[PDB]
UniProtKB/Swiss-Prot annotation, chains A, B:
One of its GO terms (biological process) is positive regulation of L-dopa biosynthetic process. Keywords: Acetylation, Autophagy, Cell membrane, Chaperone, Copper, Cytoplasm, Disease variant, DNA damage, DNA repair, Endoplasmic reticulum, Fertilization, Hydrolase, Inflammatory response, Isopeptide bond, Lipoprotein, Membrane, Mitochondrion, Neurodegeneration, Nucleus, Oxidation, Palmitate, Parkinson disease, Parkinsonism, Phosphoprotein, Protease, RNA-binding, Stress response, Tumor suppressor, Ubl conjugation, Zymogen. This is Parkinson disease protein 7. It is linked to Parkinson disease 7: A neurodegenerative disorder characterized by resting tremor, postural tremor, bradykinesia, muscular rigidity, anxiety and psychotic episodes. PARK7 has onset before 40 years, slow progression and initial good response to levodopa. Some patients may show traits reminiscent of amyotrophic lateral sclerosis-parkinsonism/dementia complex (Guam disease). Changing A104T: In PARK7; loss of protection against metal cytotoxicity; decreased detoxification activity on methylglyocal-adducted CoA. There is a cross-link at K130 (Glycyl lysine isopeptide (Lys-Gly) (interchain with G-Cter in SUMO)). It catalyses: N(omega)-(1-hydroxy-2-oxopropyl)-L-arginyl-[protein] + H2O = lactate + L-arginyl-[protein] + H(+); N(6)-(1-hydroxy-2-oxopropyl)-L-lysyl-[protein] + H2O = lactate + L-lysyl-[protein] + H(+); S-(1-hydroxy-2-oxopropyl)-L-cysteinyl-[protein] + H2O = lactate + L-cysteinyl-[protein] + H(+); N(omega)-(1-hydroxy-2-oxoethyl)-L-arginyl-[protein] + H2O = L-arginyl-[protein] + glycolate + H(+). The keyword DNA damage applies. Highly expressed in pancreas, kidney, skeletal muscle, liver, testis and heart. Detected at slightly lower levels in placenta and brain (at protein level). Detected in astrocytes, Sertoli cells, spermatogonia, spermatids and spermatozoa. Expressed by pancreatic islets at higher levels than surrounding exocrine tissues. The record marks D149, G150 as: Cleavage. The gene is PARK7. It comes from Homo sapiens. It is found in: Cell membrane; Cytoplasm; Nucleus; Membrane raft. A lipid is attached at C46, C53, C106 (S-palmitoyl cysteine).
Length: 189, 189
């Protein structure tokens, strides 16, 4: 069994907590994570001005698939950049076609709407992103902190990022690995 | 009233979640945060291989004090780098002498021990850093998720980082600002 692989797509204006918590937690789980810059190889200015250097450009990372999960951070402007990207559309449609997991948090799930991914699923988002996500009634809305309907895994905000990340770990590597990764984090529950 | 100012000292091997969560939450609170690279101006490879570009070198940022809080992220190797640094020693002793807040998380508080800061305080750390912190009995240990004894504010792990950050916000900008910053995060409590 080869290690699982995750693609985290990092755009200008991404929520840096929603980027770093899943990357770090997935690496703790032994997942090979590629932080891929939407715009290219250069550093990315996140929503609260943390600057992250991606591992690769998305252009290069997309040639090295497939991935066991594609992860979409939130941040209002980051999600808008993901939603406008033809490269993201192609990656998500390929992942959906191959029955691979797609995980999105906060405003991130609105890129699923933009790219017509996973219609008919139960989803959650940040409260403030609900109306955008629900435009057209293509999904059924959930208030769960993490929502998983098959291969569409969504979550609500910075404060649900650990739960989101651990749900990705459980989906890829199982409940026992998720529990082992969780304990050293000092989560409240 | 001018905005409060925070210095976050970023060393190789820092825990990236414990760096980014406080930076982001403090910026949401309107605090002017400087992410200062211990080693210089160049990007920093964190414990789980997230690469963060600092705002400034510590050498330059230290000339632009004083700061209302100095923040020490954890990560075992990052804290060891902070503990070995004469520049960090000088900054922490100046902050202590001026009765300014010092905040440290996970293994971060062990740099307080190394630099002889805040002896006689109640402190917490990550469970695995307790023995190092308690060598000599210079502090009294706490299992609270966040511990504040006057101007020494400590916390336990990645999963206490939001609580830690919000405690810094409350100390600097008050309980109402902390509550307002907290609500959009979708924390469980």
């Amino acid at each position: 069994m080869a290690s699982k692989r995750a693609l985290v797509i990092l755009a200008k204006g991404a929520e840096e907590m929603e980027t770093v918590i899943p990357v770090d937690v997935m690496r703790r789980a032994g997942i090979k994570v590629t932080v891929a810059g939407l715009a290219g190889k250069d550093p990315v200015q996140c929503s609260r001005d943390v600057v992250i250097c991606p591992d690769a450009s998305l252009e290069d990372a997309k040639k090295e698939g497939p991935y066991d999960v594609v992860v979409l951070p939130g941040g209002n402007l980051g999600a808008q950049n993901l939603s406008e990207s033809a490269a993201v559309k192609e990656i998500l449609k390929e992942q959906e076609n191959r029955k691979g997991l797609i995980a999105a948090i906060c405003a991130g799930p609105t890129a699923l709407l933009a790219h017509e991914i996973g219609f008919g699923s139960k989803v959650t988002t940040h409260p403030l992103a609900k109306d955008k996500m629900m435009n057209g009634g293509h999904y059924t809305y959930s208030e769960n902190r993490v929502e998983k309907d098959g291969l569409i895994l969504t979550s609500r905000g910075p404060g649900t990022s650990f739960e989101f990340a651990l749900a990705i770990v459980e989906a890829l590597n199982g409940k026992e690995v998720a529990a082992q990764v969780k304990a050293p984090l000092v989560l409240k529950d």
